[PDB]
């Protein structure tokens, strides 16, 4: 018997993971071939994302897309999103560009086509270019959801800045002791 230790035998980054509705499953059955037989690391990463769960593919907000596609050197390039695109009302300037995302919200689609860009579904993209050829790739922010302000150092430690779970925000809920040196001690 060897003396290796086994607790890291199996890599949890699963290989053919959760893939449940036929459209996404068929997209995978398509890009799997490209990932095997094309050195384009871009296809490796795109396919590796087509497995992730929705909490790991947050929605690419269109204002973010605009201010990340405006940057120099990135003219006439398709900007590709693995999540989905939700339009923003923080932006008044009609868009200018050409996307390629899984699902795009109706408002954002209206405004893109009004802008005169294009919408590309991943089949359209693959037949357009069998690999990354002048394609920028983005992602909506993934430290965005609420529960991250709950995570971290447990509140009550000297220098956390995390959000406890309380059922309101009133003055009487947690702010009693351990919060103000007028009531015993502060964090």
């Amino acid at each position: 018997g060897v003396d290796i230790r086994h607790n890291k035998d199996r890599k949890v980054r699963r290989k053919e993971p959760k893939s449940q509705d036929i459209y996404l499953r068929l997209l995978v059955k398509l890009y799997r071939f490209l990932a095997r037989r094309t050195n384009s690391t871009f296809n490796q990463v795109v396919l590796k994302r087509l497995f992730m769960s929705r909490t790991n593919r947050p929605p690419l907000s269109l204002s973010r897309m605009i201010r990340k596609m405006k940057l120099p050197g990135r003219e006439n390039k398709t900007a590709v999103v693995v999540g989905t695109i939700t339009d923003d009302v923080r932006v008044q300037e009609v868009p200018k560009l050409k996307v390629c995302a899984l699902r795009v919200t109706s408002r954002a689609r209206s405004r893109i086509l009004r802008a005169g860009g294009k919408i590309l579904t991943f089949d359209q993209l693959a037949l357009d270019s069998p690999k990354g050829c002048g394609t920028v790739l983005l992602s909506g922010p993934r430290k965005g959801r609420e529960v991250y302000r709950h995570f971290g150092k447990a509140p009550g430690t000297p220098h956390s800045h995390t959000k406890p779970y309380v059922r309101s925000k009133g003055r009487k809920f947690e702010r009693a002791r351990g919060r103000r040196a007028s009531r015993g001690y502060k964090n």
Binding site: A154, G156, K172, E174, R175, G178, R180
Partner: peptide, 14 residues
């Protein structure tokens, strides 16, 4: 109770 809810005992006025 005092390392996962930084304060639960006591009160604040008004």
């Amino acid at each position: 109770f005092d390392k996962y809810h930084p304060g639960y005992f006591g009160k604040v006025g008004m």
